[PDB]
Homo-oligomer: A and B are copies of this chain.
Amino acid sequence: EELIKEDMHMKLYMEGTVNNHHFKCTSEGEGKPYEGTQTGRIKVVEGGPLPFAFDILATCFSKTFINHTQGIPDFFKQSFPEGFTWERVTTYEDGGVLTATQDTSLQDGCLIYNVKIRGVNFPSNGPVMQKKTLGWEASTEMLYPADGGLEGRCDMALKLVGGGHLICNLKTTYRSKKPAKNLKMPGVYFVDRRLERIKEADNETYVEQHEVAVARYCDLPSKLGHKL
């Protein structure tokens, strides 16, 4: 955590496939890890233009930049210098499935991300393959300790050209590369986010994204103590 400063930069490398279309991306950005804000500027550097909506890649581009306040133990910031990994399956209600695995490390004061994606069964006439999406609504992820790490569960709503939504479900496992001895685990908690597309160009082969993410425990009264 002393390694995670008030301002920090990131660099990312990504490779993957979605329905038999291969691609690679890179990004660089910066943010304020304790305020929960960050910006990523992303280039598709192989396989552009992608034949699918860039939106389905948005959550692959940063858990160190969540505002955990001084009250919630921060699994992610605590993991440095060793870092941590995440592994996710996102399931779309029209059948698309996107798996992703990620490594986060700290090198020369810069966060370094390496992400690998594999998506299949996106319907050819669906909004993702037809590029009829308009970004994500805000969301809430529930995180809970499981087997020495954290698991996350989140349902997200993708805005559609024409006004509807297409929903997906995210199941994520977060694992620290630091021994359990050295981690204070949080209880069950929540991260509220708003991830927004700020800019794009050349048929989505350049995209700028911003996220704000703030953690909380449930602050509702408890009748089991306590309790308002």
**Among A52-60, A76-84, A151-159, the stretch in contact with B:** A151-159
Most buried by B among A139, A144, A153: A153
What does DSSP make chain A's interface, helix, strand, loop or mixed? strand
Instruction: Please indicate the chain B residues that have their CB under 8 angstroms from the CB of A167 in the complex.
Output: 151, 153
Tell me whether B169 and A155 are in contact (CB under 8 A): yes
Most buried by B among A138, A146, A190, A198: A138
Interface string of A213-224 (1 = CB under 8 A from B): 010001011111
Instruction: Please indicate the chain B residues that have their CB under 8 angstroms from the CB of A222 in the complex.
Output: 194, 196
Tell me whether B210 and A220 are in contact (CB under 8 A): no
Interface string of A65-94 (1 = CB under 8 A from B): 000000000000000000000000000000
Docked CA distance A217–B13 (Å): 34
Instruction: Please indicate the chain B residues that have their CB under 8 angstroms from the CB of A140 in the complex.
Output: 140, 142, 190
Check A139/B142 contact, CB under 8 A, given A212-B221, A220-B212: yes
Q: Does A165 contact B (CB under 8 A)?
A: yes
Tell me whether B220 and A214 are in contact (CB under 8 A): yes
Tell me whether A138 and B194 are in contact (CB under 8 A): no
Check A220/B193 contact, CB under 8 A, given A142-B139, A142-B140, A188-B157: yes
Interface string of A188-228 (1 = CB under 8 A from B): 10101110101000000000001010100010111110000
Tell me whether A192 and B220 are in contact (CB under 8 A): yes
Instruction: Please indicate the chain B residues that have their CB under 8 angstroms from the CB of A214 in the complex.
Output: 220
Q: Does A164 contact B (CB under 8 A)?
A: yes
Docked CA distance A154–B153 (Å): 9
Q: Does A46 contact B (CB under 8 A)?
A: no
Docked CA distance A122–B17 (Å): 35
Check A138/B188 contact, CB under 8 A, given A144-B157, A155-B155, A218-B194: yes
Say which residue of B142, B153, B164, B196 sits within 8 Å of A223 (CB atoms). B196
Distance in Å: Cβ of A2 to nearest Cβ of chain B: 27
